[PDB]
Amino acid sequence: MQILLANPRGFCAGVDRAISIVENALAIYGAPIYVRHEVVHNRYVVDSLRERGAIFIEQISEVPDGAILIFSAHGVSQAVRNEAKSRDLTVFDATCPLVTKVHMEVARASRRGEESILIGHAGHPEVEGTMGQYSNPEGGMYLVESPDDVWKLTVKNEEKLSFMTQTTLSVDDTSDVIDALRKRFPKIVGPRKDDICYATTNRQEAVRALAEQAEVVLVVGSKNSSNSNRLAELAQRMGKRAFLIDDAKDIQEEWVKEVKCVGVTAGASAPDILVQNVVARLQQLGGGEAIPLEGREENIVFEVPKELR
Ligand SMILES: O=P(O)(O)OP(=O)(O)OCc1ccncc1
Ligand code: F3S
């Protein structure tokens, strides 16, 4: 069995920053450090940080006075932020710069009382945080997940309309949603393409190349990782068996029995050590040397705040 590794895979700049923010905070101030939501959607990362004294909460009312609070990479609403800001808490923001970018555009539109549509998945913390930047009741903020959602949306003023997206969506599906927005709302304004980040785009392109060669694709990532789920789905839509797995123990032998070529990738929140262990397990199951595919070079790094060096 041949083992192929997707490229790029694994950690993006936002995840590496966000985890570093929590680690550094722990080093500097000691336990406990409170974190609003899982810092990234990865069980191994989260369990590790919890073992070191990070306490993960959903609501700010769970955090005691005087405490250090870190917002997760996914971002937070203005309401959450103001709810923290009014309290005695020392806040560090691990929100990925590429999510903040979208937040600022929503805020701009709200200031103008002009309606905005976000493309994204209901209930995801990034969607809650981005929708949560809009507060002007004279305008409006609408969530759409599909062309069908576009087809039934009505707005108050379609002459003054803009759209934004979640950073981790399917590039292909999002393109269909945008085509629908533009047919329904010909004057809608957006970015040139979408707000899908470089890392999401690149991993999706990489898993497409992988799935062209591999019969089976393993995506290292947790169940609640949006971007990780998109990688698995992409592979599945190409007719390959694909599994989203937290670690090597999750691999079932039937999945790779008599498979001549297995591919491995990792979502943006999955540490490389998890991939190494997955490879080690595939080798126990008869795989040879892991072969990295040729891939687009990524070179972006986001630094921690100077307050946390
Ligand atoms: O893919 P997810 O949105 O569920 O988050 P994740 O798996 O934690 O990846 C990091 C991240 C954070 C912020 N925006 C994009 C990606
Ligand atoms: S939005 Fe940021 S957290 Fe990673 S997946 Fe994209 S660089």
* Number of domains the chain is built from: 3
Strands in 115-260 per DSSP E:
115-119, 141-144, 161-165, 216-220, 241-245
d(CA 125, CA 140) in angstroms, rounded, equals 19
| β-sheet bridge partners, residue 56 | 35
- Which one of the listed residues 105, 114, 115, 126 is annotated catalytic? 126
Same domain for 190 and 204: no
Both 125 and 171 in one domain: the answer is yes
Task: Give catalytic status of residue 126 as yes or no.
Answer: yes
Counting ligands in written order, the one closest to the CA of 72 is: 1
Strands 54-57 and 2-5: unpaired
Task: Identify which of 22, 93, 96, 207 to mutate to test ligand 2's pocket (most ligand atoms within 8 A of the CB).
Answer: 96
Angstrom distance (rounded) from CA 261 to CA 43: 28
User: Is 211 in the same domain as 266?
Assistant: yes
166, 119 contact by CB (below 8 A): yes
Q: What residues contact residue 279 under an 8 Å CB cut-off, 6+ apart?
A: 3, 5, 264, 287, 290
Tally the C-alpha atoms within 13 A of residue 202's C-alpha that lie toward its C-beta. 20
Resolution in A: 1.8
**Which residue in the block uniquely carries the two structure tokens 């080690």?**
280
Q: Are residues 136 and 217 in the same domain?
A: no
**138/177 same-domain check:** yes
Q: Which ligand is nearest to the CA of 40?
A: 1
Q: How was this structure determined?
A: X-ray
| Whole-number Å distance between alpha carbons of 193 and 180 | 13
- Is the bond leading into 97 cis (omega within 30 degrees of zero)? no
Reported as type and span, the H/E element at residue 24 is helix 13-29
**Do 234 and 183 have their domain in common?**
no
Q: Is the dihedral of CA 119, 124, 125, 126 positive or negative?
A: negative
Whether the ω angle into residue 305 lies within 30 degrees of 0, i.e. cis, is: no
13 lines ligand 2 (CB under 6 A): yes
Indicate the residue type of 271.
Answer: P
Q: Are residues 161 and 88 in the same domain?
A: no
The two three-digit tokens of residue 207, written as one number: 């898993």
User: Which CATH number belongs to the domain containing residue 157 in this structure?
Assistant: 3.40.1010.20
Look up residue 166 and give its DSSP letter. Answer: -
Cα(121)–Cα(252) distance, integer angstroms? 30
Is the minimum distance from the CB of 39 to ligand 1 under 6 angstroms? no
| Residue 181 neighbours by CB under 8 Å, 6+ apart | 117, 119, 144, 150, 163, 188, 190
Candidates 109, 65, 107, 100; CA nearest to 84 is 65
Q: Which of 33, 40, 41 is closest to 63 using CA atoms?
A: 33
Q: Quote the domain boundaries for residue 205.
A: 1-11+197-298
What six digits make up the tokens of 186? 């010909």
Are residues 129 and 169 both part of a single domain? yes
Q: What is the CATH number of the domain that holds 43?
A: 3.40.50.11270
Q: Fill in the amino acid letter for 123.
A: G
How far, in Å, CA of 18 to CA of 203, rounded?
Answer: 19
Q: 249 is written with which tokens?
A: 């123990």
Distance separating alpha carbons of residues 10 and 141, to the nearest angstrom: 33
Residue 82 and residue 120 share a domain: no
Q: Residue 161 in contact with residue 189, Cβ under 8 Å?
A: yes
Residues 175 and 116 in one domain: yes
Contact, 288 vs 2, CB < 8 A?
A: yes
93 DSSP assignment = E
**Residue 194 and residue 191: Cα distance in Å, rounded?**
6
